[PDB]
Design a protein around this ligand. Sequence first.
Ligand SMILES: Nc1nc2c(ncn2[C@@H]2O[C@H](COP(=O)(O)OP(=O)(O)OP(=O)(O)O)[C@@H](O)[C@H]2O)c(=O)[nH]1
Ligand SMILES: Nc1nc2c(ncn2[C@@H]2O[C@H](COP(=O)(O)OP(=O)(O)OP(=O)(O)O)[C@@H](O)[C@H]2O)c(=O)[nH]1
Ligand SMILES: [Mg+2]
Ligand SMILES: [Mg+2]
Lengths: 169, 172
Amino acid sequence: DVRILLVGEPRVGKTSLIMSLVSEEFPEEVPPRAEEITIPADVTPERVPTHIVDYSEAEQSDEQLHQEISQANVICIVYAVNNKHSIDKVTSRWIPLINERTDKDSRLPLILVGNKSDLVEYSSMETILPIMNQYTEIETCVECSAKNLKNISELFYYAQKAVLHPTGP
Amino acid sequence: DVRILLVGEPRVGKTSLIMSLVSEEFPEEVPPRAEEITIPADVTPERVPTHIVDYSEAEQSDEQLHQEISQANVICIVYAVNNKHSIDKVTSRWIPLINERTDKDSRLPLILVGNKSDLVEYSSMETILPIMNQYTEIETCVECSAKNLKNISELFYYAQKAVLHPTGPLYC
Ligand SMILES: Nc1nc2c(ncn2[C@@H]2O[C@H](COP(=O)(O)OP(=O)(O)OP(=O)(O)O)[C@@H](O)[C@H]2O)c(=O)[nH]1
Ligand SMILES: Nc1nc2c(ncn2[C@@H]2O[C@H](COP(=O)(O)OP(=O)(O)OP(=O)(O)O)[C@@H](O)[C@H]2O)c(=O)[nH]1
Ligand SMILES: [Mg+2]
Ligand SMILES: [Mg+2]
């Protein structure tokens, strides 16, 4: 199975991203944590289902976060393109937290997700490129907007492919 | 060296994409074909020297297109999200033509680029997902907007990564 987990600082748009995918429409309001979302195996050529899991610090303990990290086989670290603090925390908090707990005999791909592209005129790539170069665990990066749905489809396609295309050609 | 070639139907935005990458501003006027671009290693996403080549049917012959395909080590097939014809030509023209190359001993990764995302509120993913499924030589896909400077840095990062770190399934 593909088991996707979204982590990242509060209010970067994790839940909104998941619920925008669900309804193909931006929800004006969201709960702290979305329900688990299922993509049936019919979608991928590998005939494998996808599960999408949300994390909310307001609702969940660090013990629960660690277990979610253990269950996931691809982790989207979400930041907001208009929030430097959320980007800083990718390297000061999220990557070390995940890496400390990953199986060193294996690989857990990470995807850097820059949400709220609808708010800004310029790219976050210049800022996140040095993070990419440092951590080969990061499989790819994407900028998107839950508000207008742009690149949301790509986001979860990339996450699936990080698991289903995990080696070379 | 990463050697990128942009192909695709007329007016999908190949030249505008390249010039928006260079200038970080959308050119309201573009020539038919950008001049060949050579970018130093330490200013590119993957830290390797990068060449970017533009194709223009009015400016170049079929022989020159054939030469450019053999020289590239990643090809971005550009379509316009609001032009179904430019999408149909991805499979009817561009992929077969690329597979006419003579030296097939090395994989030539492809990237599907849906430009002009500023014009529409829907994704082209449903349309191009069947293409991705049928043609495993396609490494990834991206939707961008030269006009709004969206996902242009991503596009060229994806292109470099296809050369240096191509991907594939666990089992064939
Ligand atoms: N403009 C804009 N606003 C967004 C976008 N995505 C989410 N928001 C807004 O950002 C705020 C936070 O969104 P959430 O989905 O609750 O973010 P979260 O990461 O789940 O927050 P926590 O659960 O507290 O960690 C809400 O007001 C959303 O409406 C976006 O893409 N663009
Ligand atoms: N709205 C919008 N228009 C674009 C975008 N990119 C290019 N255009 C416009 O599309 C037209 C064609 O752009 P070109 O860059 O000349 O496209 P091309 O693929 O190089 O065309 P040929 O060289 O003739 O094959 C021009 O009017 C551009 O201004 C875009 O991202 N959004
Ligand atoms: Mg939430
Ligand atoms: Mg041109």
